[PDB]
Structure 1
């Protein structure tokens, strides 16, 4: 099964045929891309808030308009999928979802209300793909650049009525029914420790400092509980690379930051009339970002290495979280940088998948975001910024769907790409819940 080796403009963009991305007929290539054989492994790459606009903006800046993302754009089978949520009261569609509802959708196969994790509109728990993979004996990995308590990684191991219920404190207030001291299954963090994924890497060290209000580990901090339960704790790249094995007997838990991990690129925030009043911006690498802090690609590579030891197979979810966060903050450079960051992780995954031959790789987003690419001379009512691209040309980005604090998500259907066995199930129009069934079927989970 081939990956798109190169879909960059083939020559001089000015001359006829120079902008082409295809060098010949693709029919044969696609035929060789189709297989219904069972998938032994599944790697799901999620670009939080990475809609088509985000991909295009990032490509334009980093690779040029005629450029090509060796990871993100390399997936041969493409399609568009819907991700609408539900109104808790009415049960009718809520056109603009959040991370909680969307993550729950692909991880459980049931739509839900914004803010919910692993539960439906009746607050009934729903088993997640990870829990199912684990039950079947497959290795499991949950990786993200955000706090491990954030919606996307949380949805795989937690079932709470509200995403805000990070640890003991918040749960007692926001999710009384889930609160341990009130007979519930516990907070997101507690349920995370319970679910026991073989590999869990990301940020969110902060919440682990809290103490359990009940249970066998009452009074101890969630960090202590983790150690008492056999988890291997890692806080930096050096130690991460030192891990030789990860399994149910010795699960890996890597906390590389108190909150969200560091952003790759720094840049000023978009401003009112920023494209006409202020100069064009050139993103600059974040000095904070460290050799001590592993990149998403490094975490992804280590995860695959450890998970691949399991002869039965594995399920791994990787998330480029800050694309969304930076989009909210109207920061082009941060947003774009995180997309480039995710691209590297996709490459690592695709490399392994190409060699393995029985791995389904999927790259998609939870929902669309605010950012739009607009004309250089645009006078918009929101936040704008001009950027110096790899093409030596200026690109203007606009965020104009909110006044308020952050920029809002949008309900537009978006790209979903895949490679490997059962990838055909992402072509055409599908729903986010279909992804659950596709992954479940590919893995032969029964």
Structure 2
């Protein structure tokens, strides 16, 4: 390849000098008060995933790909974060969520509780509860909201409003009798009771809010999408009844009514679009379901009204599931969609009074290499054959997972298969039903007031402490001190 302009040293030198000039200009630090705070979380978005997503996004416009800039790549400041649970070397989605939402490290499988709690033991929930940055912002008088592509009562979204010993207790249908007798409430119940004035909630998980055995409104014939609650509670009606009767509250479940709302009138919005987890971006039905960008735009439009700012949390959660299934295409497309949502959010706000942070909870064992030529398709093959079995192979691989395939002592001959298919599983080393997480560090991109405080290598729980200080909320309020 080697584009023509790239063969002149002057081109590279001029680009480097321009970057240096911008860096020198960046020494006038932004020391203003962050009226607004927005967090973007990519579930499982490792550094390798970020690079692969950048390459794919570049190639989608018919460019070589490597020189493309992601939206998050334009964030002025970058840092590294370690993501180990107090209980596990390779973290989970719950302990990390507690670490980066409440500021305290906890055990894996528990949400909103300190390390003194034991998984699946009700007692230890009492006296070991920790609040989240969302609660601090709400107590400060701001507006808060949650947007995600997974279930609302999933680990990441639930780590901001709930305190539970087990992450599997989505509703009372999944709680052992001992836990119920001891007096423990499930995550779905805690969503509508712990904090009763959450302005914006959007995502999936419609089956966990209705009495058991009730047919779904979207899939009437689907027997797996029925309600699960054993106490007969209709949680949507409970959510509606907890808000003032002189305000405006809306419940939506489908794309047509999402785009018909007037954000200048709505005050409280609840949206559940799928019975469980929302579909992949490549499998999405653009007629009935919305994309992440549209939800983010609507949420920001609704939230920006309060004169005291707002806090918003956005999660791209299906990257984790895509990696778990061993389908790199789906995960990369999810990452690209999240980057587009980040760009939209950046377009809708201003950096002189808004602090924005993008990060991930953990990593995976996804790898890509093989000495590929410039511009080679991210889902393509390696230039050479294997010098041991004389068979081809792809540039993307997994340490473990369902991609393992050895038909009678011999590996597969991918030449005879469609390796660019949407649901293709790259080969792995050891066969597992699901591929596991990774224990490497993750990257954090920050832009806005006091964003320079995230400068080097930090523990995960440090992330919410700086943001609070930027917004003059929480335990420390020295920024606004006279």
Q: Say whether residues 1:171 and 2:184 are aligned partners.
A: no
SS in 1 for 2:295: helix
Which shows bigger deviation, 228-237 or 99-108?
Answer: 228-237
Residues matched between the structures, number:
387
Contact map agreement 1:12 1:19 (CA 8 A) in 2 = no
Determine the structure 1 residue equivalent to 2:74: 74
Pick the aligned partner of 1:387 from 379, 397, 413: 379
Pick the aligned partner of 1:62 from 43, 52, 57: 57
Determine the structure 2 residue equivalent to 1:40: 35
Task: List per-residue Cα deviations over 1:242-262 (Å, max 9, x = no partner).
Answer: 333599x95211101111111
Following superposition, the deviation at residue 172 of structure 1 comes to 4.3
Query: Who wins on radius of gyration, i.e. which is larger?
Result: 2
Q: How does 1:361-372 map to 2 (within 5 A)?
A: 361-372=356-367
Determine the structure 2 residue equivalent to 1:143: 147
Over 3 Å counting, the alpha-carbon distance change for 1:163 and 1:210 in structure 2 is: farther
Pick the aligned partner of 2:342 from 343, 346, 365: 346
Over 3 Å counting, the alpha-carbon distance change for 1:13 and 1:206 in structure 2 is: farther
Contact map agreement 2:56 2:378 (CA 8 A) in 1 = no
SS in 1 for 2:175: helix
RMSD: 2.7
Determine the structure 2 residue equivalent to 1:410: 438
User: Which blocks of at least 5 consecutive residues in structure 2 are unaligned?
Assistant: 59-63, 118-127, 213-229, 244-248, 382-392, 402-430, 475-482
Determine the structure 2 residue equivalent to 1:264: 281
CA distance in 1, matches of 2:357, 2:149: 18
Which shows bigger deviation, 327-336 or 202-211?
Answer: 202-211
Pick the aligned partner of 1:357 from 352, 356, 362: 352
Contact map agreement 1:376 1:395 (CA 8 A) in 2 = no
Following superposition, the deviation at residue 16 of structure 1 comes to 3.9
Task: List per-residue Cα deviations over 1:5-40 (Å, max 9, x = no partner).
Answer: xxxx997445546678643413323224x2232101
SS in 2 for 1:427: coil
Contact map agreement 2:352 2:448 (CA 8 A) in 1 = yes
CA distance in 2, matches of 1:236, 1:163: 27
Q: Say whether residues 1:337 and 2:338 are aligned partners.
A: no
CA distance in 1, matches of 2:10, 2:93: 41
SS in 1 for 2:340: helix
Task: List per-residue Cα deviations over 1:89-148 (Å, max 9, x = no partner).
Answer: xxxxx2211110111001111001111111111131101111111111110011101111
TM-score (norm 1): 0.80
User: Which blocks of at least 5 consecutive residues in structure 1 are unaligned?
Assistant: 1-8, 88-93, 212-216, 266-285, 378-384
TM-score (norm 2): 0.74
Q: How does 1:101-180 map to 2 (within 5 A)?
A: 101-123=95-117, 124-173=128-177, 176=179, 179=180
SS in 2 for 1:348: helix
Q: What stretches of structure 1 move > 6 A for 4+ residues in a row?
A: none
Contact map agreement 1:55 1:339 (CA 8 A) in 2 = yes
